Amino acid sequence: VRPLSVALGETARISCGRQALGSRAVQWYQHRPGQAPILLIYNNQDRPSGIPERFSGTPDINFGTRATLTISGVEAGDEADYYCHMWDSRSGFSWSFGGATRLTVLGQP
Amino acid sequence: IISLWDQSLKPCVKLTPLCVTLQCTNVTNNITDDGELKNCSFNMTTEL
Amino acid sequence: GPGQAFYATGDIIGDIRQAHCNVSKATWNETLGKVVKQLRKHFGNNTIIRF
Amino acid sequence: QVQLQESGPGLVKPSETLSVTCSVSGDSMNNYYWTWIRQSPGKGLEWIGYISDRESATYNPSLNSRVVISRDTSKNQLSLKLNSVTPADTAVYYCATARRGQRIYGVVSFGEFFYYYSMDVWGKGTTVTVSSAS
Numbered sequence: 001v002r003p004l005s006v007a008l009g010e011t012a013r014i015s016c017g018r019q020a021l022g023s024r025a026v027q028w029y030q031h032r033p034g035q036a037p038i039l040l041i042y043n044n045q046d047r048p049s050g051i052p053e054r055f056s057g058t059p060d061i062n063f064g065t066r067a068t069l070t071i072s073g074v075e076a077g078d079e080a081d082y083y084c085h086m087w088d089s090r091s092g093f094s095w096s097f098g099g100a101t102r103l104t105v106l107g108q109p
Numbered sequence: 110i111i112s113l114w115d116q117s118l119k120p121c122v123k124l125t126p127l128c129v130t131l132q133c134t135n136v137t138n139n140i141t142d143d144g145e146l147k148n149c150s151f152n153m154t155t156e157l
Numbered sequence: 158g159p160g161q162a163f164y165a166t167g168d169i170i171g172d173i174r175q176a177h178c179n180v181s182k183a184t185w186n187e188t189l190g191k192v193v194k195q196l197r198k199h200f201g202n203n204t205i206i207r208f
Numbered sequence: 209q210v211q212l213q214e215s216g217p218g219l220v221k222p223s224e225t226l227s228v229t230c231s232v233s234g235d236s237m238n239n240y241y242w243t244w245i246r247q248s249p250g251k252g253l254e255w256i257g258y259i260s261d262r263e264s265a266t267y268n269p270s271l272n273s274r275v276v277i278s279r280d281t282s283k284n285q286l287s288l289k290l291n292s293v294t295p296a297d298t299a300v301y302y303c304a305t306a307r308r309g310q311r312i313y314g315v316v317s318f319g320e321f322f323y324y325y326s327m328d329v330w331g332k333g334t335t336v337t338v339s340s341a342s
C-alpha cells in the first residue's frame with residue numbers, strides 16, 4: 001500500500017514503483033473498497049468505454065516517462081486502491097499486480 | 110589491405126588479461142530467446 | 158591497464174531485439190531474375206536455375 | 209450484458225478444497241478469456257490464474273501449483289479448485305474476463321512481440337473464510 005493525498009478539484013499523477021525495463025504496455029485498475037475494480041487505462045494510450053476523461057494515459061516514447069496516470073479533476077469517488085499492471089519485454093510475464101497506491105482524497109465537505 | 114590492417118591494431122589495446130573464467134548467465138529475458146546475449150561477470154586486474 | 162581500458166557492453170537500455178537486414182522483395186526478385194536471364198546464356202538454351 | 213456472478217460455500221476448514229463457480233450471462237463463452245482474482249485483507253489484488261478458449265489452465269507460479277481451474281460450457285460457468293488450502297486464503301474472490309492484446313515492439317517474423325492480458329469486464333466477487341471454525 002502506498003498512501004497519497006490530494007485536494008478537491010485538483011489534478012493528480014498516479015505512478016507505480018516498477019520501472020519500464022524496455023517497451024512497456026501498462027494496465028491501470030481502480031479498485032474501490034467493496035466495489036469491483038475497473039480497468040481505466042490500457043496499452044499506455046487507450047481508455048476503454050464508459051470511463052470519464054479525467055484520466056489520460058502516458059504514451060510510449062521508447063524510454064523515459066513511467067506509467068503516470070494523470071487524474072484531471074479528482075472527485076470524491078477516486079478514493080480507492082489504484083493498481084499499476086505493468087508489462088514489458090524484460091520482466092516477461094507479469095504474474096503480479098504489484099503494490100497498489102491507495103490514493104485518498106482529503107479536504108472534502 | 111592486410112598489412113595496413115595490422116598497422117592499425119598494433120598501437121591499440123591488448124586484451125591478453127581479459128579472458129578469465131567468465132561466470133556467464135543468460136540476460137534478463139523471457140522464454141523463446143534463440144542465448145545470443147551472455148551476461149558475463151569476471152575478475153579483472155585493475156590499475157593497481 | 159594502467160591507462161588501458163577494455164570497452165565492454167554495459168546493460169542494454171530499451172527493448173531486446175535482434176539485428177536484421179531488409180531488402181525490397183520487388184527489387185530482389187527482379188534483380189535475381191535479370192541474373193537468370195544472363196546466367197542461362199552460359200548453360201544451354203533453357204535450363205532450370207536454382208538458388 | 210456480460211454478468212459475472214459468483215457462488216461458493218463461504219466457510220471452509222483447513223486442508224480442504226475451495227470450489228467456487230462464476231456464472232456468465234448475456235454473452236457467449238468463446239468470445240474472450242477468463243480468470244479469477246483474489247485479495248487478502250491487508251494485501252493487494254493477487255492473480256491466481258487464467259483460462260483461454262482452448263481450456264488449457266495456466267496458473268500463477270506464486271502459489272506453488274496448489275490450484276486447479278477449469279470451465280464447463282454446459283453450465284457456462286468457470287470453476288476453480290484449490291488443494292492444500294492455508295488459513296491465509298480467507299479473502300475476496302473476483303471473476304473477470306481477459307482480452308489478450310498483442311503488443312508489438314520488434315518484428316513479427318522473429319517472434320519479437322508479446323501478449324499482455326487485460327481485464328476489461330469484472331464481477332462482483334464473493335468472500336470465503338477458511339479457518340478451523342465450523
Ligand SMILES: *[C@@H]1O[C@H](CO)[C@@H](O[C@@H]2O[C@H](CO)[C@@H](O[C@@H]3O[C@H](CO[C@@H]4O[C@H](CO)[C@@H](O)[C@H](O)[C@@H]4O)[C@@H](O)[C@H](O[C@@H]4O[C@H](CO)[C@@H](O)[C@H](O)[C@@H]4O[C@H]4O[C@H](CO)[C@@H](O)[C@H](O)[C@@H]4O)[C@@H]3O)[C@H](O)[C@H]2NC(C)=O)[C@H](O)[C@H]1NC(C)=O
Binds near residue numbers: 063
Ligand atoms: C523490414 O521489414 C519489416 C517488416 O515490414 C519491418 O518490421 C517492422 O518493424 C517495426 C519497427 O521495429 C515494428 O514496429 C512496431 O510495430 C508495432 C505494431 O504496429 C504495426 O505492426 C505491424 C506489424 O504487425 C507493422 O506492419 C506496422 O507498420 C506497425 O508497426 C507498434 O506498436 C510499435 O510501436 C512502437 O513500439 C516501440 C517499441 O520499442 C515503442 O518504443 C514506440 O513508442 C511504439 O509504441 C507503441 O505502443 C505504445 C503503447 O505501448 C504507444 O504509446 C505508441 O504510440 C506506439 O503505438 C512499432 O512501430 C513492426 O511491428 C515490424 N513488423 C512488421 C511485420 O512490419 C522492419 O522494421 C523493416 N526494416 C528494418 C531495417 O527494421
Ligand SMILES: *[C@@H]1O[C@H](CO)[C@@H](O[C@@H]2O[C@H](CO)[C@@H](O[C@@H]3O[C@H](CO)[C@@H](O)[C@H](O)[C@@H]3O)[C@H](O)[C@H]2NC(C)=O)[C@H](O)[C@H]1NC(C)=O
Binds near residue numbers: 136137148150167168
Ligand atoms: C548483468 O548483470 C549485472 C550484474 O548483476 C547487471 O548490472 C547491475 O544491475 C544492478 C541492477 O539490477 C545494478 O544495481 C543498482 O546499481 C545502482 C547504481 O547507481 C544503485 O544505485 C542501485 O542501488 C543498485 O545497486 C548494478 O549496479 C549493476 N552493475 C553491477 C556492477 O552489479 C546488469 O544489469 C545485467 N544485465 C542486464 C542487461 O540487465
Ligand SMILES: *[C@@H]1O[C@H](CO)[C@@H](O[C@@H]2O[C@H](CO)[C@@H](O)[C@H](O)[C@H]2NC(C)=O)[C@H](O)[C@H]1NC(C)=O
Binds near residue numbers: 130131132150151152
Ligand atoms: C573473483 O574472485 C573471487 C575469489 O574468492 C571469487 O570468489 C569465489 O567464487 C566462487 C564461485 O562463485 C564461490 O564459490 C566462492 O565462495 C567465492 N569466494 C569468496 C570468498 O567470495 C569470485 O567468484 C571471482 N569472480 C569472478 C566472477 O571471477
Ligand SMILES: *[C@@H]1O[C@H](CO)[C@@H](O)[C@H](O)[C@H]1NC(C)=O
Binds near residue numbers: 139
Ligand atoms: C541459457 O543458456 C543456455 C546455454 O547457453 C541456452 O541454451 C539457453 O537458451 C539460455 N536461455 C534460457 C532461456 O535458458
Ligand SMILES: *[C@@H]1O[C@H](CO)[C@@H](O)[C@H](O)[C@H]1NC(C)=O
Binds near residue numbers: 180
Ligand atoms: C531503406 O530505407 C529508406 C528510407 O526509408 C527507403 O527509401 C528504402 O526503400 C529502404 N530500403 C529497403 C531495402 O527497404
Ligand SMILES: *[C@@H]1O[C@H](CO)[C@@H](O)[C@H](O)[C@H]1NC(C)=O
Binds near residue numbers: 186187190
Ligand atoms: C520476379 O520478377 C520478375 C520481374 O518482374 C518476373 O519476371 C518474375 O516472374 C518474378 N518471379 C517470381 C517468382 O515472381
